[model samples]
Target: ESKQKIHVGPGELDDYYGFWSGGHQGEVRVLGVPSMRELMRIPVFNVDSATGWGLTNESRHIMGDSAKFLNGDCHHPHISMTDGKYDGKYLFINDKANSRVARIRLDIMKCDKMITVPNVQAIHGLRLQKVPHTKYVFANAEFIIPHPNDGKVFDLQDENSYTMYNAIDAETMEMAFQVIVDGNLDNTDADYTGRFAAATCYNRDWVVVFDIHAVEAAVKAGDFITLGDSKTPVLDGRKKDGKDSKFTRYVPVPKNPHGCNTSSDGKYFIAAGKLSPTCSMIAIDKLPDLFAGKLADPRDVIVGEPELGLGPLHTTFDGRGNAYTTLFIDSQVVKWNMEEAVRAYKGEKVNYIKQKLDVHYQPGALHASLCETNEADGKWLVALSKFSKDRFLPVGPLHPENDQLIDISGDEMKLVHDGPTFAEPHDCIMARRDQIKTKKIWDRNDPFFAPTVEMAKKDGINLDTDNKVIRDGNKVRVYMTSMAPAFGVQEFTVKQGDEVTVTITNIDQIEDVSHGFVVVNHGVSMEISPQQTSSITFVADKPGLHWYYCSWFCHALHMEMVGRMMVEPA
Candidate 1:
């Protein structure tokens, strides 16, 4: 054998696993590292019949009519951290398509909660943010919109058009407050949170740093809130003249910075850009001085920026005080010494390039394990990439994007394998199997698992509580049961301009059996897990014949699993 490999039992942990955003397919793609085997697909925003994401009446009912769209368009899968380290208990995924975040509990391998990010402009924008030091998570807007469904063009002169970031309660999964990052109409691409939360604005040459402590305090004291949503706070990210403690600063760097990561000890800050050929480094000790305007020079805080070549997009750190960035245009992974980069930033000579591994396709982000205690185990990096011509077998046009695997377990970097991945896996992260005690498979008796309809009723299932759909003049509440190809009320009536609430219960006890109910044209959907009941509330503003069908595949009857909604004028 040419390589060293770890043995795994049935349903046992792999040496490593990489979780990535299933760009267009709307799923979480998990890949076993070293071996680079496709392990399993975790359903999030998209409709999945296999895992029961958008299926089963017991839990799938999540969206409502005249509301946000169903899952799909998934972005950023942020693994839950423990004590600023990767404990891997739960993971968070973003739906930028609808400004929503779903929390997937790894213990049971299911999405237990979904929170609609509030106070956000309804047009578009949001990438998941999880600061290392705290139990806080932030979802920042990428693009600004006038309002939900408003057709107004972006006006540069209007500061109201600027982007916003929502603070979510990590424990409860609710939007606590919203903060405005005062700047031009700049779009936030990727961000890292350490002592300060550093976000890379793709459209501009700046890293917007938020005084993390100040923002967290402002949110708790109710110092911040979005316009029209609540009473507001000062609208600046943080201005020089605002408070004794200003909140935001436009840290000047080169153009188009994408990937970013802090050192394992949280000592240094590193980032790279698409426009520049160098990887930028920050002396963490020099940060407070830079914030207080006491830098030796404007660029002094930035100690090292080693030139790799072509386009440098994303970076990840290793346990051995080194940093690695994926070079997009040059098609390479550049490994550099963090300690050396710090010395060079101080006008000292240091060789920053440690090694470089050539990747076949264009890579966007490559995340490392970053476990300092285990150097050999931490050497795994999952490269999320774009397609290259003839790199592997052709799977039509979009079926195969590229994902290059690498191993830095020895003195030099080595490419392990190159092959295709999901439709467009935009981002990725990995964890060592030994450090992570997560269960990827689930059956009955799982904490979040629901049983059959009769069994679940004792646990609060109420399908026969009342009539399927109850109408109170302009307000209506509907009770429904979803099973395989049929429902209690396949067709229902509602008045135009009436607010209708649809509740669905999956009576089927078949394990892994799920169901989905949705008014597709109304921009709402819900997934009812087996033995669980769920609901969605929306207004029937448009009058038409809309079919509410089972969105997930269940069997041969799945295609014919349809129900009709007849909306009439009030």
Candidate 2:
């Protein structure tokens, strides 16, 4: 059997089209491969002018009316799809723009339902974990809010700043618990403090955590409850009320933490500190025993040396327990042996050598992975480069310089993959059978459906059309509204194992090139040109809630072109 491929849509298309608009309008363009070279391009869903849901007043109002906004910016798709359990039949996706977690049924590739996270914004990372007695979904809410004055510093204190949600049951898609580290807390002066920085789950009972400078102070002063530990401090300062007493103490880290992961044994949690260009490895057993209402000093197992880079965004562990880290600034992947580091921690004599691989891609380290291939006895390390002039670029194991396979033994490591390929590859995971199942679900629905033609005619506007949709179990319908910039929706449904197709027709009079659609969770996408249509097809094998939207830049008027689909069980 051929290896299954998991597709991640980065919402980067030609020009600046799609739902995400604002800031650096001309900074980047959509440049990732739309069809598969090894795998087939399965069509799930599509939207165009005939669907009455193309560009709406809400979209235009968010983006402006300038030709630069419409002509330059086009809609694209940016989504992460996973085969994690949700009733055992649904695929999960994070709707970044809408601030919601969605689930789609596998059988029909339709939107089953969505859970709205009230205080969370710009969710970047998501994962599903099942520990003993605990089955839940974990997502990293790396929400960024731009500051008014600094232009770089965003108000992390706003409700959008800090959050970690735990699903009640991974099978039912129920949210059981949520924790937010309020970044606005201050011990000395209530007014001065920053928000929580980036964080990732380490294990079921604990998470390797960190906070921005301001928020860290508050945690150390015992302003919030510590996880897996219990402690309360008595007030002794200037305050007479006992309420001024600190509640929890946080272990200080060297720098701002960004991405993190843990060993398979759940013994150690490793975190990457962004500015530090180094990683902090914390042993679970070495942590302070604060459960008795006392603070214990944290023991640092390994203090990694600083590597020259801007953002060491994420870290992961290979099956062999070796640590792999990504460098955003320099766009490189580093490999380290943890067993030797652990032996060093025990004061045992151990020799260690560091290995680094330079992946020549820009906007570095969005996400990458190291996996042992089933086809061979060797391991392959895969990394993604963001949307650039090229669509995708593959490094290590696939780069010609190294041959797509990396040989790591002792202190030396060599690259071995065919390179000079992979255009704008962003986030990548080990393609599995479950991903193939999800793609089948998307294949059941047609993607091309245009409704803007009739909408324009009714409004006395002249526009062409080349869109169509076929209704079966659930009729596929399109609608165009009269609001500014115009809007529309294409609704359809599918059964398990049924093939799905979609065609999008472009019919706007002004030929606003900034238009496109993405089927949420299914990883199906299309880039529509003025009076031009694009179509896709796939099979419906997963069940849950899915959504599609226009990720384009139309000034302040681009938010109007967003919509969703609900896939239910057959």
Candidate 3:
């Protein structure tokens, strides 16, 4: 029989992967791009038997370390940037339910660790924003704590909630510093950071901008005092950058402001206040004047609030300057040709909307990931829905949750694919096909791989016969052990014209997670997650030598997750 075509079975896969946050599931979902197929689930502040997360030896702390499962209300999946652009390196997601955040190393596709948001028991996840090219992921404190100052219940009048935004170190995923804003404030929703960071107040009004540059200075010198009760640095907005004050600009912005974003060139700051049909865009150039209460236009720092539609909640910008906003009430995502809008607002009129996509239910949050392609105009936007009534399989007339992705490819927006997130997803971040690449993920596999932190610390789970090779007549039994940074250290050799069965076990005892093992050029790829013991059978018809490795990134050193596949002459 002559085989002219190849069929993709259980474990075989293609390159291109994207990340999404799990709402109720409390984990990160890795989806294969192009196909949009759900790949692996990375357990963060969530408990799962699939990865032995809660039951593992050294990984129980991931659940909460408080003996409670932290099935986090995972929202706001943000990809760290390099030089103000998406770097496709580390991904930071917020556990708004537990006042926590987890830094995921994208290469290995694992939530290696998580840290607590100090003085914060809960927060609106969108506050998880990072300063571009800087080593900080800024997280804002929303609600009031029990004024740890006096060890008593918070007195509403006597103790105004001293709101603070914590700056998490990007490299270590630890709280590097936090800037305190002393006064009455509402929920800190969305934020954007550069040399300085601005956070929007969602409930009532106002947005606060801290001199991150000055905050970092105080962080290094210990100049600005840190209140031990909350472990946050104080910035006096009332005073100038004088002998004892960290500079801050507290400006009154629009109300119900759900979204906050900055431009790529670092010129403008735009945000959408939900109650109003318009969205506000502030010129960063006018910051000094506005911060000093010297600027005009009724409210300080407020320049343009162009009318977009019924409920513009969140906004994400494309590198080319178009901002895509999700309108929750009107149920759509509108793209504002920012460059053109900026051109118009400068002279003749207000900014105008370019294109809009009518979506299902309330489209709450949206984010655009820049791409490598010149066609499709080089970008895609993932629109998150508040609810999905008729978009899934019947679970007793059950309505489904949404994570509808659309194509913002230039002139027009296209409704492309749908994912059964199986959870109420809030926000997500996507990495381009070029941004996320693998060394080797070839061949085929069955019972695909995805494991937990058990891959590193489990007992007696090292390499053994279950991961070695054996031969009987023309039948070859190749047992492979695959792990992170390096897929497999051992090589398997087989003669051409032999029926080869590759049995792979993920022996990386850390999280008992899955490791990908495949010889892709002439064979199939197998994704073996932590604790996965699966096999794939194929004919070694292709002669000569080829390379194989773990396609799934397990860690920083995963490039070594490679091996040789020798198919000698029959």
Candidate 4:
């Protein structure tokens, strides 16, 4: 019965879209939630030849000099929000391998902006602003490094050795600010009010909280210093003499908490203890009092310390005043009442442990346990089983991850579906189908390739009509239009040693009538959607007729959509 609910018949669509991070693969994947069907992969931090993502001029420009680094370890895929709800304008993800963050435009489903955060190592924990709008994308650098890190301070125990909390501007994808904090950061989350953000620390027993408004005010007041060659403002948020700083407050928690999550109702910040069996529930309303120095102790903000189960790594809510926490050691999911836990902490005769369901498979290192919506409708919950040993047919030593879907609408949890994810999907988030609005066809004036188009105009070439090759010394610029079964420029000539730049503009007006360009033996290929423009540059080193064709099947006569590049020996 549970499996029947998740089944989608032929020609039917799923109710939700699940955006999953392609962990070490360095890409973003889209999947239909209920049906567990893979939709598409949006290459972010990695090089993809299918759509020529990192090879294209536009993508290389977005990646900047970091394009040279091929590998990316992406985690924590988050959708931009407005007033604590998913706006679906952009989806942000972090590259843990390269210390970078990338933003994908929801309409085009392409990465348009990426930045290497200054003065930080690995960006592990990431979250977006919740209310009003997502003005800032908060990131936490996991590894602590010495200042300057240039053999100047080599001591690992040096006083200056530390990591930072980063905030990137959502619009420009630039570093807004960085905060120096205690210990190595793990997971992070933003409150619904948007006034605060918090992160968990593994090396220390503390939950770091940041006052977003105060951080901005402190930066405006010049209460920050620049580190090394980076001009980005770095605010000192470390605790001094066991006292809290103005920008950050380190609330003490149990041993090495892994996940820091905000409650759906905006009432509390829950930090799940990795070493211990309890989750520290910090009262969001009491944070103002604690920050104002009104509370007697910083621990006063912790309203409940619910003993969840063995190795409670992450927690998610169900709209009905209940929270489901993943037990790593127990390999189970514990459903408990938050209000009852709070009351039980206050010496009330109430049992908060609702039920614990065994997953059978050892869910080792399960980080991304997610609910369906921000409103916590409690319909479905996704458990990213990190290790799927003996679950499927073994294909060598490397096994696939099991992304299991659970039915959370009823009293008892039921396993609905099991999906074999190819790569490591570190985290995932879901948005309603109606929330995300994707374009069927590219806009003529889309900013993605507008700069390339502008470059063509500077070369005195109209991309829509020009089929001529402009030559300037050893540089050759070939501009053409692609329409289904034909390219405007069927053949072009250039010197064997010349640098060739091929720009294609698809003037096709129909939806899904996209085109592709590929020059065999030149390592050149790119996809051009309807009314979209794409360009790539490569050196014509071989003296021969290099064949080119549309890699994307656009028409019944797609094979006829071929061209050639004649390179004369220099």
Candidate 5:
């Protein structure tokens, strides 16, 4: 009978507005509840003046923008939504401005279909598999670094030229097989100055790679080199004349490898080597005795060193063996031990902690999700954010003005839900109270809130004329209004096997601010406060095109405070 866990925040926050193309903007929050010191802003995508582009899929209200592709603002959007069955249900995006990889359906939310994959730019980390009968969808083409004035080095014309893709499928949605993962450099002469950035997939069939080393640390006085190789090696192979010699790579690899996980018997694959400032651990059943093709050199299995953090990026595993990372240049979150690194690799008693998170300036991207109530009291981890610490520098220690909720066990850690605030939080799971009490009795028998108020009045939104819907079987109920300050009743729809429930009661007066509702592809969510009230139940089984907004960053300028949740097929 222990089932009830809810954590909310998904309104808006996807900033990057600097390094070219006004960066990526999208903010929210408008007075419902959750407040650190109150927040209220809005602007669902700006990229300078190009308006919106790429990586936005609240069930297809649409935004794989970046003018449809190619060199589109350099690329930076990674999405996810899965149900398996050959992995084709939909909501899998990564248009990183057209390097390609899209699929949107959520029952008519719309992206109709897409499939492009050329010289992949920053195709953010994605993973989808199916094992038992095999079906694929693995991505991670990332390797970006071109803004050093864009003269282009890490900006790549060919920094050792790396690549990745998988794509397969079968049971009907077609397009079976894409593969394409080239990068050999004889096994690791820093493999073409390594750039793959992120990947994770264990038992489902090995794939644990992460790269970004970037060397050049001389120090001389007492001779330190830590990992040296740079007497002035910034494109020396001659320029335009040498025909760009494959963009030159005399030496220097590993710069910001980012988070990774897999090792509860999947046979080892931990990563987070951020910037040589180590934390590697690979093994994957010895990758066919070290890259099989007789290449043998890539063996560094476990490295260590993480204490200052440059970009550990993401890492998770609290299913006991413990290992949680997320540094992004010391905004903080660390905890590692993996059974004491396999009992110090068989030798014995080795302890490690690296502990540092009290939640400070958390920058963009940090992932973690494990909450079947912490996998049934086995207590798991749940961390994920896009960028906070109050949007970079006003103070420090990781800022976000002392945001809390630290709690790690075994090696001692504690922060415990500090102020009940979060803005850039991203990708989180762990809300399974028996899947919300079996979707609240199948959403009290289901009507799916009467076609989500007739698709929010055909999208022009105005609901409340006397709105009312109620059920008790699977537990459905509704009592709507003009929604919020973001221009009221966004939009909604439902069909596929129904079993839904929503209770948004913020009536509006805007104060410390808070209002969250998510459908981000079937992960229904809630968070309300003003005249406060919140409830959510789900079980629309798997259709296509779903969305719901107000993850609160608050009113940047009426992108309609956020909305969408089509879901058709009945």
Candidate 6:
């Protein structure tokens, strides 16, 4: 019955879409919930030859000079939310390997913007503001480095040797501000109020909470300093002389804390103790008192520190006062009551532990449908297993990682299904089908290719019907249109060693009629969706007749849908 309920038969669609971070693949992967079917991969920080993410002129324009780096290590994937709900506007992911963050437009499921955080390294934790709207995408740089990471000064014990908590503007995807904080930040989460955000530190063994209001005021007052040549406002958030900073309040937690997650009710921000058996629950209401200097002790904000199990890494909510935490070393998921835990911490004799189920291997991020939203029904939970071992059939030594879907509607969690995944998926988040409304085809006036259209306009060429080649000095621009079975321009001639830019526009009005342009031996390719325009620039270095064909199987005569690029020797 579990298998039947989880199965999506032919012609059936899954209820929710799960966005998983392609850890080392440097992309965001889409999977159907319940079925756990891998749907699509949205290339962000990595290069994708199939879609020409890094090779396309538009992609290169977005990446700027960062396109030269061919590798990325993506860690967290978070969707934009409106008033604490998934808005389906944009999906933000971080590249820990490059210390960059990228934004993917949900409508087209494509990465449109990316920015490398200035003066930072290893952006690991990422979260978005939820209350009013997704105004800022909060990012955490995990590694502490010199202020001017530029080789001029290298001192680990220097006062400037620290990492930053970055806030990027959601709309522009630009670095709004950077706060220099203590210790190495691991994971971060923002509260529903949008005024507060918290991060867990692995080195200092503390959960540092940020007052967004104070940071904004500091920026407005120009109280922040700059690092190197970058003008990004850097605020010192470290506690000096054992006093809390105006922009931050550090709560001391036991051992190395890993995941910092806020409860759905907006009552508390839970910091999971990765090495200890307990989790620190900082009361949201008490933050005001602490910030206002009303509280005598910093620990006054911690209403509860529930000792659930060994090696608790991350936590999720049921929206019914119960919380589920992944115990890594214990290989279990523990369910406990929030209110009961608070009561027990206040000297009341009560057991807050509801249930504990044994789950094998190292459990990564455990998420439920709309887990971060106010409507956390907690009907389903997905646990990511970092190692497979003997869980699946042997495929030599490299086994597929198992993602277990468990039924959380009942009192006891029932293991429903196990879906195998290739590569590394660090974290996952689920959004309801109603939350995300994607477009079937690309819009003609979409800004994604508007710059290319502007370039064509400057060249006195109309991309819609243009099939002509314009030569400007040693630069040649070839404009063509694709309509199903044939390309408008069958052949074009260019001089060897000339810089050629091939711009293709798919004038097809029908949905799913996407065309791909690939020039053999030119190291150039791009996918042109219906009504979408794509362009790529390359040097005509080869002095021969090179063939260019449609890589996408669009029509019955797709093989015939090819053109010639005759390069004359210079």
> Evaluated with TM-score, which candidate comes out highest?
6
| True-structure RMSD for candidate 4 | 1.7
Candidate 2 runs further than 4 Å off: 1-91, 104-112, 143-169, 182-249, 285-295, 299-311, 345-351, 362-378, 386-425, 434-570
Local distance difference test, per candidate?
A: 0.63, 0.38, 0.62, 0.86, 0.39, 0.88
Write model 1 residue lDDT over 1-570, tens digit each, in one string. 224353355676567777777776777877776566777787767776443455433335332221234456665677666546566677777776766777777655567777766546431223333345336565666665443224474564454555665656666776655556644222232223434656666553766666666666666676654565544343447344544245666666787676555666556556686788987776667667766867655467677777777898877766766677888888888888877776776778768788888786788777676431223244666677785678876666554767776666655766766657667777766767765565422343443434333443443536644335676789777777766878778888888998877777676777667787778777667666675566666789989888888877766889888988889975
* Model 5 TM: 0.27
Which lDDT tens digits does candidate 3 get at residues 1-570? 112112335676633456778886788888765456777788787765444454343344443463265467776677766555566777877777777878776766666567777765564534334344537776766665554546675664444345566777777766777665544333232223455667776434666666667767766777765455645555444333422244566556666576777655556567687888877776776776654557654254666667788988887766666778888888998877766665565575654687788888798777665421111123566787867777776677545667776766556877776665667767666666677643232222211122311331132233333355667789876655665665444677889988876656665666544566556665455556555555556688988887776766778777776788789995
Candidate 6 residue-wise lDDT, 9-99, digit = tens: 8999998899988888788999998788988999887889998999998998888788888878886788898888888999999888888
Whichever of 5 and 6 has more TM-score, that candidate is: 6
Q: Specify the poorest-scoring 10-residue window by lDDT in model 3.
A: 444-453
Q: Which 10 consecutive positions of candidate 5 have the poorest summed lDDT? A: 14-23
Query: RMSD of model 5, in Å?
Result: 21.1
Q: Residue 441 deviation, candidate 3, in Å? A: 11
In candidate 4, which residue ranges exceed 4 Å CA deviation? 1-4, 364-374
User: How much is 273 displaced in model 2, in angstroms?
Assistant: 2.5
**Clashing residue pairs found in predicted model 6:** none
Question: What TM value does model 2 have?
Answer: 0.47
Better of 2 and 4 by TM-score: 4
Candidate 4 lDDT tens digits, 227-344 = 9888899988998888778898889999999888888788888999879899999999998888889999778989998988898888888777888888888888888999999998
Which parts of model 1 are misplaced by more than 4 Å? 1-3, 6-13, 55-68, 119-134, 146-154, 182-194, 202-204, 230-235, 238-245, 292-298, 370-377, 434-570
In Å, residue 196's CA in model 1 sits off its true spot by 1.9
TM-score of 6: 0.98
Q: Rank the candidates by TM-score, best first.
A: 6, 4, 1, 3, 2, 5
Better of 2 and 5 by TM-score: 2
